[PDB]
């Protein structure tokens, strides 16, 4: 899969608290190759580290993630981000170097008229992501210790 690596950094502060979908934000210079803006199913891995990870994620495990690439046009954000909602987990990822692999495209990035409309679609994105990643596990015969995909 195409992938990017970089530290998880601070965004607008709205994902978890306003939308109920915390996103681990990464920002890249405009020279770095990314997939098209859009929503993706993929895997987020905390790279090997001696830094302690607070919460229920550990290094070197591929966690199922629903991923956004773009400028969050519903909100009118100013920089392109890669943003990963890690399914069914809760950890403090700020400052940790992570790898994000883009496995499947789910849909185009969209400017919604309201947060309600966006959340309705994000629920479907997450459901699709579960299904698509389950297929990926089978396609690569991934060893259970190496990934996390709840239910």
Ligand X SMILES: Nc1ncnc2c1ncn2[C@@H]1O[C@H](COP(=O)(O)OP(=O)(O)O)[C@@H](O)[C@H]1O
Residue 119 interacts with which of Zn ion, Mg ion, ligand FMN, none, CB < 5 to 8 Å by class: none
**Contact positions with ligand X (CB under 6 A) in 59-98:** 84-86, 89-94
Tokens 């259970």 correspond to what residue?
144
Q: Residue 23 CA to chain centroid, in angstroms?
A: 6
- Which segment (20-28, 69-77, 104-112, 119-127) binds ligand X by CB under 6 A? 20-28
**Residue in the structure block whose two tokens are 């929503």:** 39
DSSP 8-state assignment for residue 114: S
* Subset of 23-82 contacting Mg ion (CB under 5 A): 23, 25
Cα–Cα distance, 106 to 104 (Å, whole number): 6
C-beta of 145: minimal distance to ligand FMN in Å? 26
| CA distances to 111, 118, 119 from 63, in Å | 27, 23, 22
105: contact with ligand FMN by CB under 6 A: no
List residues binding ligand X (CB under 6 A).
8, 10-17, 22-25, 84-86, 89-94
């Amino acid at each position: 899969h195409f992938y990017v690596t970089g530290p998880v950094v601070r965004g607008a502060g709205r994902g978890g608290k306003e939308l109920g979908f915390p996103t681990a934000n990464q920002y890249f210079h405009d020279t770095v190759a990314l997939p098209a803006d859009g929503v993706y199913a993929g895997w987020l891995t905390i790279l090997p580290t001696e830094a302690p990870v607070s919460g229920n994620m550990e290094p070197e495990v591929a966690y199922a993630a629903a991923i956004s690439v773009g400028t969050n046009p519903t909100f009118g954000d100013e920089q392109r981000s890669v943003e990963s909602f890690v399914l069914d987990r809760d950890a403090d990822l700020y400052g940790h170097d992570v790898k994000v692999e883009f496995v499947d495209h789910v849909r185009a990035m969209e400017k919604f008229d309201s947060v309600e409309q966006l959340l309705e679609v994000m629920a479907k994105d997450v459901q699709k992501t579960r299904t698509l990643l389950a297929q990926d596990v089978q396609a690569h015969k991934m060893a259970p210790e190496t990934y996390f995909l709840q239910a």
